[PDB]
Structure formats: C-alpha cells, structure tokens
Design a protein around this ligand. Structure first.
Ligand code: HEM
Ligand code: HEM
Ligand code: HEM
Ligand code: HEM
Ligand SMILES: [Cl-]
Ligand SMILES: [Cl-]
Ligand SMILES: [Cl-]
Ligand SMILES: [Cl-]
Ligand SMILES: [Cl-]
Ligand SMILES: [Cl-]
Ligand SMILES: [Mn+2]
Ligand SMILES: [Mn+2]
Ligand SMILES: [Mn+2]
Ligand SMILES: [Mn+2]
Ligand SMILES: [Mn+2]
Ligand SMILES: [Mn+2]
Lengths: 308, 308, 309, 309, 308, 308
C-alpha cells in the first residue's frame, strides 16, 4: 500500500515517529484538526513521494472524546478511553491523547519531515503531549536484548487480527490501537542471568526460539499474552514496537503500539500482564518496565478518515 | 506484479524508455507487428528475468488507426487519435504513432536491452518516430526543479482512475495513455523568482507543499489540472513523467505520460491547460514548455493484448 | 506473503536450501514430525523476523506414503510416489523422501539457521537423505551458462499453474512439487560450441532469446517442455531451480524443483524429455545432466498444513 | 580507516551522535575517564564489528582544563577553552565540556549502542551535559533547506586543513574541534523569500551553486567564512554538521562541529560571523540561528590518546 | 578519493558522461574557459555532495592547441594533437576537441546535472562538439557482448601505467587521455558465431577467459593491444569504456577512453590495431567498429589544473 | 586494493571459499601449478571484473615443502610445516597442503566461479584435499553464537601485525597464514549456560563486550590468545574466520584462518590454547571444537608471486 494513509498492515521499518496530541477546546481548533487529519494524504505524499522506494506511512488514530466532537452521531462499536489498570505491584496509567500519528519509513528524515508538516499545519489547534523517535535495534531487538515482534500475525492473519470486518460494517477497514511508552530499569534487568530473562519473556534470547511447553513459566510474557477462546481459537494482535531513548537522561525505552479489530483482545492481554493470570501471577517484564503513558485510539479506514 | 506486460500501475522507476513507432502499410508488416506485441511477454522475460529484483516492465499502447487494422470489429469505447489543441498563445500538436512501448526498470541497461530486442524483432515492419530515455532527477523532480508526480493516485485510487472497469467490460483492465514530449526554455524559467515559479506550478518548490487555498492562483498548473464534476467528484489520472535531455543540443525536457480509464479526463485537463479556464486563463507552465509530440494510445489488458 | 509457510509463489532468491528427509517408522516419530511441520510457522518467524526485509520462506512438502500415515482418510486427488522413467541411455530414478523443506532467502545464514532449527526440532524422528545449498549464479544462470527460469509464469498465471483450485476443493491452494538433483558433465558440455548448446536448450546463450520457429529443434529442451493440450491450451509449471556444487568432488549441479496444480503436467514434461516426442526424440540436456534423485511431494495450503494431527 | 578511533577524516554519515560530558572532580573519576578514553577502541570494535560495512566511527575530544589533569607536562600548542564572543545582538557562549564523543554510522542503533556502552563504562565519573542525535536530511541539507557541507576540503586538502603537522610534532595527526548547538527560528526564516535566503547563505538554495562575485554579498555566510591570509593563502576547516530536533518542543537545529589543525582559523571565522567584517557587518544566518553551546576540544591522534595515563 | 577533480584512477561506474568541447577564438572565451576548468572543484562539489556515497567524479582534459593558449611557456612532454591513422582497410580520424569532461557517478542525474552546470558556466565561450551518455551494460559488458575492461591495471599498476611520474616532474600526477567514439555494425557482428567472435576479441565470451596461448590469433584484439618492450616489460593503459546507443537511429556504440602516462603506448596500440602487426594483420574488431571521433587531451594534476 | 592478488588486509565478507590442494610429484605438475599461481591475477580479474563493486579477492598461500620445489635458493625467514600439538586433553594435527586459496567476495557465485576456474586450470597437476564454503552468520557471529573477529587489528595495526617488513626485506609485503578447520559439538556447547560460555570465550555473548579484568578467567580464549612481550608490547594476528556446515552430516564448523608477519605469534597462541598457560590451563573452547586440519602457508607478495 504505497503512500496511502491508514496503512495498518505495513511491515517493520528502520525508523518511526509516534506523535500524541491533545486538540484545543474551540470549534475553530476542532475544524483545523478535522481539516488536517482528513486531508492527511496531502502531506504524506508531499514528503513520501520524494523517496523512490515510497516507504513512508502514516496511520492517524482518534481518541474517544475527540471522536465525539467530530462524529457525534456515528461511532465504531468499541471506541472508549484507555482503561487504567491497578495491579498488585504495577499499574498502567490512562493518559491524555486526542490524536495519534504513527509514522514509519526507511529513513529518519522522512518521518521527521512528515511530522514537521503535520505539526506546522495543526498550529495552535493542537499540542504535542508525547513524542517518541523509534529506531530499529540490531536484528529486530528491543533494548531488553530480545527479538521483538517475532510472532506478529502476517498477511491474511494480520488483516483478520487487526482490521474491522463484518462485525461493525460502517467502520470496515478501520482498527483500534493502544500505545504505552515504557521505560526500563536496565541495571536491574542486567542483574538477571540470560536464562532468568528468557523465563521472563518466554523465548531464548539470542536465538529467539519459544521455550518448550514444559519449560515455559505460567507468568512468562508469552504465556500471559496468548489469548485462546473457549473454542480453542487464538486471538492475535499486530504490534509495531520500537526502541527509543536518551543517554544523558538514562532513558532506555520500548514504545509499545498494538493494533486489533477488537481492543478487548489487547485489553485482556494488559489485564493478564498487570493483574496476573491467575490474579497475582503478573508479567515479570513489568518488574523492569514502567509505562509512562496509556492511550486508546480508533483508526478510521481511509474512506472514513477522508470524510470526517 | 513481476515481469507481466501492461502493468500500468507500477510505481516510479530510476530509468525509463519511451518508444513510439509507426507501422508499415502492408499486410506482412501488420502481421509482424501483431506477432511482436501479442508475444511481448517473451522479450520482457528474456531481459527482465536476468535481474534478481525483477523491476523491468513494459506497457504496450496501440494507436486508434493501427488498432482498426488488427482488431477490426471490436474497439474500446474511447479510442480515437490525439485531439490537437490550438489555444490563444500555445498549441499542442497531434503527431503520428501506431505503437507505444513504455518501458521502466531500476537500471538503464535493462530498458535499453528490452528496447533493442523489440526494435530488432519488428525489423522493417515499423519505424521509430520518437525515442526518449527518461531518468529520475534527484528526489523525484523534473528539470524545472519541482517534485513531479506527487499527487498521483495510489493503490485502489490508482486502479479506479487508470483502468477500464464495468463501464466497458470487453476491455476491463485496459487504459488510455497520452504522451507529449515537452522541451523547456530553461533560461526563461530561470529568470523567474522561486516564488513566481511556485505560483506557476501550484506548490512550494523545495518542500513540495500545495499552496494555501487563498494563495493558489486560478491559472496554476495544479488548479487547471484539478478535475471536479457536477456532483463534486474528483477525477484523476496516473502520470509517469520523466526528465530527459541533451546538453550539446540544449534540450531540457519533461516527457509527459498519463493513463486514465477515460481519456475525456486527460483531454479536459489539456483543454484547461492550453485554452484556459476561463478562456485565455491558460497554464503558465506552457510559457516555458513546448509540446513537440502528442499521441493517444489504447493500452489493452494483458489478456486482450495476447489474443490479437 | 511475508514470513508465511507454504508460499509457493515467492520470486527467485539469492540463496536456497533443499532438505529431503525420511521419517522414522514409529508412532512417536510420526507424532514429532506432525508437530514440527504443522507448527512450521514458529521457526520460520523465529529466524525470518530477524531480517528487516523478511525475505525468508519455507515450503513444506509431504510424500504420498507419509501422508497416509498422518491423514489416512483425506488425500489430495493426485498424490502418488514419483513415477520413475527409463529411456535407453537416461533414467529418472524414484528416490526416497517423506518430507521436503524448500527454503529461500536473500542470505545464506537465514536458510542455514532455519534448516538448523528444523533439523534440531525433528531430532531422531527423521533423517536427512538429501541436502542441497543452492545459490544464484550471475544473472540468474544455471552452471550450463544459460538463464534458467525465464519463462516461468508470473502473478495470476503462476497461481493458475501451480495451485490447486476448483478441481479439488478440499485442498485448494496446495500444490504438487517434484525435485530432481541433476549433476552435469561439464567437460562434455564444454566440447559443444555455443550454437550447439543453444540448439540443445532452445534459446540463445548470452541473450536468453528463444530461437525462432524455423530454427527451433523438435528435441530442444524448450520444445519438449512445451505442453499444449488437444484443445490448444498451454499448461505451465513453476520452477525454482538453483545451481549447487563442490569443486573438490567435481560436482556441478542444477537442483530442479517444479510446482504444478496437477503433477500430470510435470510428469508429461518428464516423459517427453526422457522418452522423447516422437518416441526416441529425447532431450539432449540429458546427455549432459544425470538425475541422482527423483521425489514427489504434496504441498498443503497453510490451513491444511497447520491442521495436520 | 576501518573501526579506528580518532578518524577525523571520515566522510558524511546518515546518523551521528554528539555527546559532551563533564568529568567528576576526584582522582578516581579522572582515572576512570582516562581508562575509558584511552581504551576507546574496545567499545568501538565491540559495536562496530557487528556491521559488515564497518561504518561506525568515534572521535574523542578532550577540553583544555581536563587535559591539564591528565597530561600536565605535555600539551598541544593551541589548546585553550572556547573563546566566547558577544556582538550587539548575537553571542557565542562558552559552555562546559571536558569530553566530546563525536560518533558517526550508517545506522542509528550503532551510534546509540556505542554511546550506551561509553556512558555505561564512565558511570559516575562523568555527566552528560549535551546530547544530540544528528540525522542526514534529504540530499545533505540542513533544516534551513540548504545543502550543508558542500565546500568541505577532501582527501589531501582535508588532511592539510584538519590535522596537526610539522608545526607541533609531538601531536602530529591530532586536531582541534569546536562544537556549537544552534537552534533555528523557522517561522522567521520562512518569512524570507528563497532569493533572500540565498543572499544570507551565499549559494542558490535548490541547486547549491555559489552566487557569482557581483551577486555575492559581503556579509553572506560564505564570504565571512572564507579565510584568505596576507600571502593570499586560503585556510579551510572540516565540518560535519547535522540536523537535529524535537517537534513537540519546536526545536529545529543544526549541530555545528568543525575540525582544524589550528583553532585560530575556526576562531577567526567565528569573529567574522559574530562581529562582522568590516566591523558590524555580521553573518545574517545568526538572525535565524542562536548558539546554545560553545566548546573547544583537542582531538589527540590514536597514539597519543591510547598512551593517556 | 571523494569529490576531487582529476581522479583518473576511479573504479568503473554505472553511468558516465563524455563531453568534448571546442573553445572560442577570443581572449574573453579563453578567460571564461580558464575560470571554469581551474575552479571545476566548485561544480563537482555543488553536485556531488548531494549524494551520500559521493560517487561523482570529473576528469578535465585539455587539448594541445588550447593548452598553448593558456599555459604558453610550460608544457608536458608528450602533449600533441591526436595522430590520425590510415590503415589498409580501416581509418582512425583526428577530430576537434579543446576540452574533455569525463564524468562518472553511480547515477545518471548526477552526471547530467554536473554536465548541465559546466555547460551553463561556459556559456558562449565553448561549444559541445561530442556528447556521449555511457551506461554499464549487464556484467561490465560492451554492446558486442564481451566483458569490457577486464585486464585493466589496478592499484599500484594503475598508478604506474596512467600517471606521469619522475620522468616529467613538473606534471607529476597528470595523464594523457585518448577518446574514440566507436559505432558498431551489429547485424554484421551477429552473423559471426560465438567462436569466431572469441577469435576476434581474444577471450571467451560468456566466461571472459583469455584464450590459450596456442589458440590465440595473432591478429586478436588482445594480442594486438599487448605491448611488450625490448626488455620484456609490459606497458598498460587504463580504460574506462562505456556502452551508448540510440535505438531509432540504430546506433550501438562503445565509447573508448584510455589513460596512459605516455601516449606513445596508446598510439602504438592504435597502430597495431589499424595498421596491423605484421602490416595488414589488423584488428578484426575494426571490421565491426568504426571510429567517429579521435582526440587526445592532457589531464593535469589537480594542482596544475587549479593554477591556470 | 581492487582485484589484486595477495590482498591480505581485506575487510570481512559475506562469503568466502577456502581451498587446500596438494601438488603432483612430476616436474610437469610443478610447472603447471607455478604457471597458475603466478598468473593468478588472470582468473581473479576474469571473474572479479564482472561485479561492479569489485569485491572479489584471492590470497595464494604456498606450503614449506612445495616452496622448496619452486624457489629452492630463496626462502622467507619463517617458512616451515605446521607444528602438530599434543596437549593434555586436545591435539592440533598437522595435515597436508601445498597450496591455499583464500577467496572472499560479497557473493557466493563469485567465490565459486573463481574456484571453478582455478581448479580447472590446475587440472591433474593438483588435488583438492580440503574445501570449505564460508558464510557470514548474522551480525558477524560464529556458530557458537559469539561475534567472531571483534578485536582484529585494523589499518596500520593490521599491516604491522600481518605484513612482512624490514625484518625480512626480500619478502616484504608477504605474510604467513595458518588454517584449521574446526567442528563443534553443538549439543555439549548448548548444555552450558550463557554465562559459562562467556567465561569460556572471555566476552559477553549478545553484547560482545570484553569481560572485566576481575571476571576474566585465566584460561578464557581471550586471555590465552593475548600475546604480550617482555617490553609490554602486544602482538596481534589478523583473522578471517567464517562459519560453515552441513545439516545432514550434523557438521557445524568454524574455519579458522590467521595471518601474521611472524607465525611464531600465531604458533604461541595455539600452544597456549592447546597446552595451556600455565601448562594444563588450556582453552575451554577446545572442549567443544575439534580441529580436523592444521596447515601453515607462506603468502608471497604480489611481486614475488608473479615471478615464481
Ligand atoms: C511541461 C510538462 C509538465 C510539467 C513540467 C508538469 C509538472 C507538474 C508538477 C511539478 C506537478 C505538481 C506535483 C504533482 O505531480 O502532483 C504536476 C501536477 C500535475 N500535472 Fe503536470 N506537468 C506537466 C504536464 C502535464 C500535463 C500535460 C498534464 C495533463 C494532461 C498534467 C497533469 C498534472 C496533474 C493532473 C497534476 C496533479 C494536480 C493535482 O491534482 O494536484 N501535467 N505537474
Ligand atoms: C538439468 C536440469 C535442467 C536444466 C539445466 C534446465 C535448464 C532450462 C533452461 C536453461 C530453460 C530456458 C529458460 C527458462 O525458460 O527457464 C529451461 C526451460 C524449462 N525447463 Fe528446464 N532444465 C532442467 C530440468 C528440467 C526439468 C526436469 C523439467 C520438467 C520436469 C524442466 C522444465 C522446463 C520448462 C517447463 C521450461 C520452460 C520452457 C518453455 O515453456 O519455454 N526443466 N530449462
Ligand atoms: C547555524 C549554523 C550554521 C549553518 C546553518 C551553516 C550553513 C552553511 C551552509 C548552508 C554552507 C554552504 C554549503 C557548504 O559549503 O557547506 C556553509 C558553509 C560554510 N560554513 Fe556554515 N553554517 C553554520 C555555522 C557555521 C559556523 C559556526 C562556522 C564557522 C565556525 C561555519 C563555517 C562554514 C564554512 C567555513 C563554510 C564554507 C564556506 C566556503 O568556503 O565556501 N558555519 N554553512
Ligand atoms: C570498438 C572499440 C573497442 C572494443 C569493443 C574493445 C573491447 C575490448 C574487449 C572486449 C577487451 C577484453 C577484456 C579486457 O578489457 O581486458 C579489450 C581489451 C583491451 N582493449 Fe579494447 N576495445 C576497443 C577499442 C580499444 C582501443 C581503441 C584500444 C587501444 C587504443 C584498446 C585497448 C585494449 C587493451 C589494452 C586491452 C587489454 C588487452 C590485454 O592486455 O589483455 N581497445 N577490449
Ligand atoms: Cl522523527
Ligand atoms: Cl534506454
Ligand atoms: Cl544453507
Ligand atoms: Cl544515537
Ligand atoms: Cl548524462
Ligand atoms: Cl564457493
Ligand atoms: Mn504461540
Ligand atoms: Mn488536490
Ligand atoms: Mn512458449
Ligand atoms: Mn571558495
Ligand atoms: Mn596479458
Ligand atoms: Mn585485549
């Protein structure tokens, strides 16, 4: 899908930019934001066409509250604000955001320039409340040192997992996305042996092979994030996480971003991670990772976005 | 996508070859021509398969007159010779062409070699009347210094704009292509300021951003080439323009090529450009650009081309 | 089709790995094999996701005999062992194989690592009986010096040629694949002039242009592998042959692998090549190429493979 | 110069990292710093060798004050703190820094990982006071939209411009580097027409062609940064500026970094830019660019750096 | 190596531009020409710096006659006009040229743009008399189908063969370059068998292996272009030939360009080729190739070029 | 150093080929081998020139015995056969080899083709006794999972470490190389924890960081292979090791190849590894790696090779 907005199914990229904004209260602010997001193909092409490979993509997400301001009388089935989670040891906050721009390209300059044109076009109508410049780290790893994304669904599976279908026909082709900015405690993480780390994640570290059933702990990240319904059907989400950080501020992060046709799947993963399954048996990744943000967005299809 | 002829929807390439030929009057000439074009998959693969990436593509177009020699009692709805235009200041001529080969690849040698094999196979049955070796110029620019092709429809929009559909079902998947070889007056263009050049085109020069609605002249290239019908529906074409040139002959060119499911769209753009809207309010691009050729071809689907 | 098993339609790659294995006789062995092949997407991603381009692919084939052990009451319409052929001077032997892994990637390490993980997961439940590390050779040439793959069908034609459709709906999207490891007699081939080599193949050597009708021999590789039925309809196969060899053993080979929605097409090509058309007018490529293996496998669709056992 | 520290002459890269740190006051702190910088080839290889192209490089600079703590009785001829400048409306401040790491690579992860390992090895012995992640912007442009670096000297001229030679033999192959982090006023710059911007810089914008003599303003960036001595000899510096920024903070910057065998050249350029020539005829780039830092460092040769302590 | 003019030793490139110009008779013309060529580093960097890889190079050559206008009382030892040759069957003409720009890059646009800027800077002071856009053809082949440039000296050998040394110390680091634009008779060449073609060249065609000593004809291109002196010392030249062509004009060409520290080597090769060794035993390449131009230039070192 | 034989200092490559041969006993065999190796630039260019990047290199090594047959009266200072080592637990055999070809390129086909032409040109005059097709494994790792080559000397250090200098002036520019084909016990290796493995090697596994002094065991691979003279000067070697293997034969290998201007440095490393320092404290890498071959070759400079 070349230089088309709302391309949820794009493969991983070398660079990304995650912009979360809050819209101003006026109707003028509302109208500027609407103009910009609905014509987002304009700047996407203005920047993206300059690269022969045409790698640049831009997914626009709209928060529950803001959606109500621009489409009061027509709403996707599962749009609501992000549900805060308060677990026995760790919590996932719900933090502000009216707009998400999830931008990816083969090159940092293309991300940066697209962001520059979007922010400039929004002017005073919106404020950036979170900004993360994601980068690929070695062979698709996160800063914990593990290959991150391995089990993503691909092709038809990706589309079945992430894209709204017959269950909500007026919003077919759309999706729901959750973001969380995580910061890691690297020194604590490095006190663990590699084997302890593998038991936390659920895969071997260098080789990125899922641990055997009989060595797979019940609170591993993989176990807690495997969602199987009563008919034995697995329900997957599409993740585009990227590393980020700042060396001077000792910040080493993983920007989580996950797409699903029904956000309850993602929400259940989060509940199982933060509260545990069974309750108390929580994800030991959270012993080394703290979420600074937590926001849910509806991702309209191109058609719906273009007519807002 | 790989190594199939009539692939109208291919993204922009580093190199291009445009060959326009006239066929011989005789029945033997018609027969050779018909053999070469209906078996064009042969040379396409003979050349294209030698490159791992398989970037080589070849679109064959057939003029109205030659189409009648070769497919007498079956014709696409809108196939007719290129309509010449005689405007208040500038004119677009209608020049000969029975065959078009629009060849693209990541490399020049691939273009040249495919060209060489097509020209050799045709032998005395056909004569090259126009030959242009197109090249990508910096970040997708034309020799006027502007990013050229930015607003092209992509994905579904590209297929809806370029490819014949339900409306003419015997020729579904075909297209109509117009070419015009433009020569620029570089020294005249260079006497304009960047800002005046921007007013002529409709977009900022370095940054490739569409001028604000309030700043957009009504005779800008962008305005005159925007086609909106009575119902408020926009109609687009798919362009694959490339730069070409000769330093010794001081020739600096843009080779225009545009595909549409209905040439009425392309032709209306050309009228607005050359005649003006309102009349005499013509495209100031034409003050620095002169069309040396002008030819319309029908682009059969792969299936229709192969049975001929 | 990014990192999905059974991607029969993937374009040519720089590196490939062909693994042919025989499964152990026990119920335990069969169960381990079933587990590995129906979970093949696991190692595929474990390895493939580490490369940004996601070039890695893996096609699993299952032999007729093994298929009956693991899906006794549901079988694609044309699954049978490779049919051997014997001409007077050249033969196409039928050699063992229950499992095929046809692995492709932009890089050798990716093919090797995926092979390593698969072999490791199978452990004592299967034995490697053939292993070939294929490599792209110049501009898509085989070791005879000819561009090899030129006329492969692409896109819709590739899908129409290779994949089971309405004729056998329970296995739609599957395919039948035949492999033959050919070893070349390089010094005999080198005694021919270029023009003689071109008459053997049916295309010019450097330029890879098909010889025109009047110049195309009735026993050229191209002529005998052209299949036009009574109704005048052409039937194609999808090939992904690669060069392989060992300098010290003097082995210079072409690993033939051809996919078809119905192996009758591939089998008729082989009959024409080895037995000739008219009878005895065989394919002279076989004067310089000797098949050391010959095996047929059913390639199930993803859904069918994942459901196994 | 593959994976060797102090490679001042490396060509432009897609990504860079500029780290400026202040060393702790203790003997322990100094010793840890000494250990890390004189062993810098260790982390350089640990990270860089993982990339086949070996694009990663790392130049270590040491401030005048820190230098005296760790090599009290041997000092290059021109090592002194950055000399601040104050014009009537624009100033070049002198800001803290004992250590510079100027890291470049084809990829961001390589710069980041090397920075991570260096910061980690220094631990509490040094503090990061400036950190900039530079990136190539289109066709070698800065965020003002101009090609930035065009006239850099190359090969022998680069070596002649940047590296200490016979004038100071104990430090042959070293250099002096100045950094300034500039932030731009983008909306003010955008109020200029292209032609006005070109008169500010001294070259055409899209085409990056130097304005001819009759059209070149006496206060253009190019004119004021052209240094021709009394004898008519030109003196150049080697620059490796990169774009950087933050959209939410509205920070759009150029990180200036310039190497010279004698910082007098760079210092005279800065005087001309900030104070003007003739006096008051300053560089109008400064109307749109404000320096937030200003620091000078000695870049020792490999041999000198490795020998430290 | 990067972006410095007069880089004779650069490896082969994907694209090339050969510009040969004659200068105006006047003193103003001489002055402009002298300004452009002595400041050629300017345009080289203006263009070349825009490409991260910095592949762009430009070698300036000056003909004997123009050199005398511009450096009257100081001349390299072997600078004289191209010596025409009149052999038993084939002839090599001596055509005009004051200036040569031999431009190479990984991309055509870089070549074209540098060319455009040089031609513009020269304005009316000089006229393009020959222009050739060279391109790499498959695996380093010429349009005769043979790998072209195989035996080129590399590294120290390339410097010893091409660059003026101790023997003429005022011009150290300079070179002498000969160009000839050859046009092929493709249909005649194609009537030879591969084996006969191999006998003509001196090497196997696909495999690019030198024929066995016993199988190597004495009139092969390889034999006639091997120069061994009395002492048994071989003398080599550095060639940078490129294919060029026009399909409509049926022009298939090899642009020959050869650098030597002493043109006596190149000239002897040309005599052996055109006159034969023994006399009349000439290069059978010349039966399928006709030289349309022939010009000799001195290539000053960077230092000598810049003070002029 | 482009397409030049005996390029010892080339950086790591994606592919390599290691060919070890024994020459036949006749004087005819001796003469054929001499012809081939001394003209090795012929096939190097015949194959290498076909790749634009020109990555192909070929280093020829000559064994002690064979050298005596072709240069009986002139010998480099340290040429002798490989010294077998018999340690408390492991041994390094000395195995046959008259010729080494160490071939590297960006592509397997270039290695293979060069090898093909060499073996063909040697015909019956020599027999291949060992053949290994090396490949790059992920981010420069060996099959033990560790980055392999990290501490290689580079630039001036590489030349000082590997190339014969003033100490043996008649062979300046040459080198000495040792090869050992190692096969690993992967199952035994994988019983170790990552931390145990790191203590065996002397560096962290994923991060490839040398262990601290106080955690660096005295029998680690790194400790045993660090060679410091009595003046505190370290003596380094240049290694080009590559992974190889065969999945059907359960072969997972590391082909060791190491260059030094004085092979005593390499030999001392081997003694310390196999016998231990102090005696008995041997390299625990050898508990998981067995050397199947062991051969020493002299690497002549280009000049010396070309005049054999
Ligand atoms: C001298 C020849 C021409 C030049 C140099 C030229 C240049 C450009 C440029 C720079 C743009 C803006 C970027 C973009 O592609 O969106 C553009 C847009 C366009 N041009 Fe042209 N053009 C030429 C001829 C033509 C002709 C002959 C037609 C129609 C028959 C045409 C149709 C268009 C259209 C439809 C657009 C998109 C406008 C929009 O919807 O925003 N152009 N052209
Ligand atoms: C020694 C092993 C073989 C070699 C070296 C070889 C080589 C080639 C070459 C050079 C071509 C022409 C370029 C192309 O279109 O691919 C070709 C075509 C072909 N080969 Fe093979 N081949 C081999 C074995 C086989 C076998 C066993 C089959 C069938 C079972 C086969 C089926 C084909 C087909 C169908 C074509 C396409 C012919 C056409 O429709 O134009 N080949 N082969
Ligand atoms: C806001 C920060 C700056 C920006 C945006 C900037 C931009 C540029 C640009 C666009 C050029 C022309 C292309 C080129 O040759 O590089 C240039 C040239 C140059 N700049 Fe800067 N510059 C900055 C700061 C500095 C500083 C602080 C110095 C000196 C200390 C400097 C020294 C130079 C030099 C020496 C040249 C080469 C001029 C010539 O010889 O033609 N620049 N700069
Ligand atoms: C029609 C124009 C020409 C063509 C098509 C052509 C083609 C070739 C070919 C295919 C080779 C063998 C591969 C290699 O480069 O080593 C070659 C070699 C060579 N050519 Fe040319 N050539 C042409 C004109 C010239 C001219 C005019 C000269 C000298 C003035 C020349 C000098 C050489 C030399 C010195 C060699 C290397 C021979 C050796 O030492 O092995 N060529 N040429
Ligand atoms: Cl960004
Ligand atoms: Cl072309
Ligand atoms: Cl493999
Ligand atoms: Cl960084
Ligand atoms: Cl050009
Ligand atoms: Cl190999
Ligand atoms: Mn799972
Ligand atoms: Mn529009
Ligand atoms: Mn056919
Ligand atoms: Mn200047
Ligand atoms: Mn020779
Ligand atoms: Mn060490």
């Amino acid at each position: 899908a070349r230089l088309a907005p709302q391309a949820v199914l794009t493969p991983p990229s070398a660079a990304s930019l995650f912009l979360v904004l809050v819209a101003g209260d006026s109707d003028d602010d509302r109208a500027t934001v609407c103009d910009v997001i609905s014509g987002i193909d304009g700047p996407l092409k203005a920047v993206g066409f300059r690269e022969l490979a045409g790698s640049l993509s831009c997914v626009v997400g709209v928060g529950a509250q803001f959606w109500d301001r621009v489409s009061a009388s027509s709403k996707p089935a599962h749009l609501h604000p992000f549900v805060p989670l308060s677990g026995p040891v760790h919590s996932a906050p719900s933090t502000p955001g009216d707009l998400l721009f999830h931008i990816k390209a083969a090159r940092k300059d293309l991300c940066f320039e697209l962001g520059r044109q979007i922010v400039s076009a929004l002017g005073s109508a919106a404020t950036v409340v979170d900004e993360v410049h994601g980068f690929r780290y070695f062979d698709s790893r996160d800063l914990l040192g593990f290959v991150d994304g391995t089990e993503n669904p691909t092709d038809d599976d990706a589309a079945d997992s992430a894209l709204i279908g017959d269950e909500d026909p007026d919003f077919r082709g759309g999706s729901y996305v959750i973001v969380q900015k995580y910061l890691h405690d690297m020194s604590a993480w490095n006190t663990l042996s590699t084997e302890e780390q593998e038991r936390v994640i659920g895969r071997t570290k260098l080789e990125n092979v899922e641990l055997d059933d009989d060595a797979q702990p019940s609170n591993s990240h993989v176990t807690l994030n495997t969602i199987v319904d009563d008919d034995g059907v697995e329900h997957d989400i599409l993740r585009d996480a990227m590393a980020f950080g700042s060396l001077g501020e000792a910040e080493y992060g993983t920007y989580f971003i996950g797409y699903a046709k029904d956000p309850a799947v993602t929400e259940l993963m989060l509940r199982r991670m933060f509260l545990g399954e069974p309750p108390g048996n929580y994800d030991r990744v959270l012993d080394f990772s703290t979420a600074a943000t937590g926001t849910l967005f509806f991702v309209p299809s191109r058609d719906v976005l273009e007519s807002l």
